[model samples]
Target: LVHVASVEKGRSYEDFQKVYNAIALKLREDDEYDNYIGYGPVLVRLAWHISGTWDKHDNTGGSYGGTYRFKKEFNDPSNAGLQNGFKFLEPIHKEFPWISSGDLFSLGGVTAVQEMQGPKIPWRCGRVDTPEDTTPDNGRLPDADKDAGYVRTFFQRLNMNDREVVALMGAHALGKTHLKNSGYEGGGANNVFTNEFYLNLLNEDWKLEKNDANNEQWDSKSGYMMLPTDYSLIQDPKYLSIVKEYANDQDKFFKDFSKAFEKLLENGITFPKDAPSPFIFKTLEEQGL
Candidate 1:
């Protein structure tokens, strides 16, 4: 029998892989969120929001703890429909219970981003859980009703530049802005993930429509949705150029999105290169039997 040595101080690649498999396998099993398109995209967004809370000055908010899976955190109003993401992860947590919450949550973000063809984000371990009282309040996330100026201002808290902001929104290309979740709806065929977000920016003859729900989704023949903030990408001069750039070239969007996303995941942390070169673990389907 293997003698029980002390558990390792940090998670090794194998440790992370086990956690990855748990999330990956569960993602495969539960494919019924947001109309059966799978919980993949929203899980990524939940991961991103959790990490996005970090403020560089204090380094207080971030994905250090897996607390978001907790009831108090999960019940966050801003996280309305995100309960689906938490439910999606529940079984995974039970399978490999030893993994740190920080590791599982961040890895979910990393896995979702890469699996969605967005980027290879380098991640590190060692976030210990804080008490419930330590949780930050809502309104830290971006708003759908705002403008380019507010979007830019909001991202500054996370230390993102204009290009980074554009690239992150490029992720809007992947998931829908759920009407129930964000009070905005239908940005592209929400089920499909594509750089088509950029195209909608350039091509659509957008007429502002107030849905029966009384929220705004730009009505184009495309039947997709773009919040006022999303539309501001094209409405603002500098932001418009980046939006159009991604529109005209998928390769450029992919490259920029990868770089920007990796940076987003690394906010407020330092990692030694020896820390494993930001593992790009393969998707489960990629490892054929």
Candidate 2:
């Protein structure tokens, strides 16, 4: 059950940097997706979903296998809207066909985050593809309708604590949710990455109401929204303190998220002693592109 990282055959930082630039440029050009929220948030979600399938117990599903490319994982009800992200990467993959699917998928997330002005997630390259039977079952991802205790327990499966859970959930700040995809709908769209999710949670006056999908979500008068799983951070006292900490400090949030996100994508995969250091990519703006 040990999956050691092996850098994609002789590839180095510059090779992956080219892939990053490709993803970043496409993100800017594909500005019309998800009602103009663009591809950044969905790409981020794609990366999370793929890496999130990991189970620390058995280490069955994870970004290491790139199982999402298989039909079973792709057809998972939880992954309904992700095909858009996959399709968005199709051309990039075609051009850079040498990149492993796992590498491309995870790197897509990293590129999206940096391009959208989120944290710099240090990414590692490896993740050789495994057979279709290696894909984990469909129900592993967290449910949005749950409460704080459920959310806490759910994240525990992936080995995340309260602070990490709250920090990762800050990604909710990006993009509006479409009810058709996740049985929840956000009140507005945000393509930029920030600590605003924590800020919105602490600041907004929210109401509990069921959506057209008969799922309960928290909505605020200011036209913002939070899933039950997201609002759970505030409902639990321990999670609340971390949420408040992130809300007040943008730099701290970014730094924490960078660590947590890279951890999330790297869970269940082993890096050899001689493995290259994780890559911190430059944003397009940073590169003066």
Candidate 3:
């Protein structure tokens, strides 16, 4: 089905910039969570987990629906630890009640990336909230326990290829996986966004073992961890090549990740050619933060 942009009434780049600023300011203000790793990582993950539900097959469960506000979607076992991100966003949503859930959630990610020194992710607004019935059932997200083949096939439904898959997984650099949340225990570069994930994957000596949660994860002496799905990138030849490429060039990885991440957020939603061009908000540094 063809989907047209639903630009909010009387809203434009300036308005959304305000929303972005609010998110950024709050991110700076809220620095106590996760041992002061701050809310940046979880916000990005929340944006991702919301958008990751998209299925190109049926065009359902995408960030377009904002259905995560629904109890069912919010309670999905796969979303266990995301409540933290949601709570962090609560005040922003209340302050700008005009913004739709999907837009805010997705933009939270874009803001987090830029604020944390990641690449600029062009964002377009206009995701109207839908009824709870519109929410896709649980089990649509990927399994953390899976392998290379599983990761490859899972993203296929989202129309992602090997390079795109590898580029997107580069996001693992932003946040650590909580043991209580997904049974996985670690991630690299807990705050700053860089190609550090690929570097660690290629350079670090990781031991394969089960965490106390009984899930298999790759652990490093640096207190970092990689999920089985993460290790799959190295195990598979195709994914491994991209991992090496990214490890060698941070610029290349940032550029590729910006594109793939934009695509991932826009998946399952069609925008007319006449739709407004994407917006690149200024970073806090640009604004003299």
**Number of backbone collisions per candidate:** 2, 0, 0
Measured by TM-score, how close is model 1 to the native structure? 0.88
User: What TM-score, over all chains together, does every model reach?
Assistant: 0.88, 0.98, 0.97
lDDT of 3 by residue, 216-240 (tens): 8999897878888998999999999
lDDT of 1 at 122: 64
Show model 2 residue runs off by greater than 4 Å.
none
Q: Model 3 lDDT vs. the true structure?
A: 0.89
Candidate 1: residue 24 lDDT (0-100):
72
Better of 1 and 2 by lDDT: 2
* Each model's Cα RMSD: 4.9, 0.8, 1.2
Q: Rate the local accuracy (lDDT) of all candidates.
A: 0.71, 0.92, 0.89
The pairs that clash in candidate 1 are 186-225, 187-225
* Position 98, candidate 2: lDDT: 89
lDDT of 1 by residue, 100-189 (tens): 666667677767765555545666565555677667666667777788999998888888888888888877766677667667767543
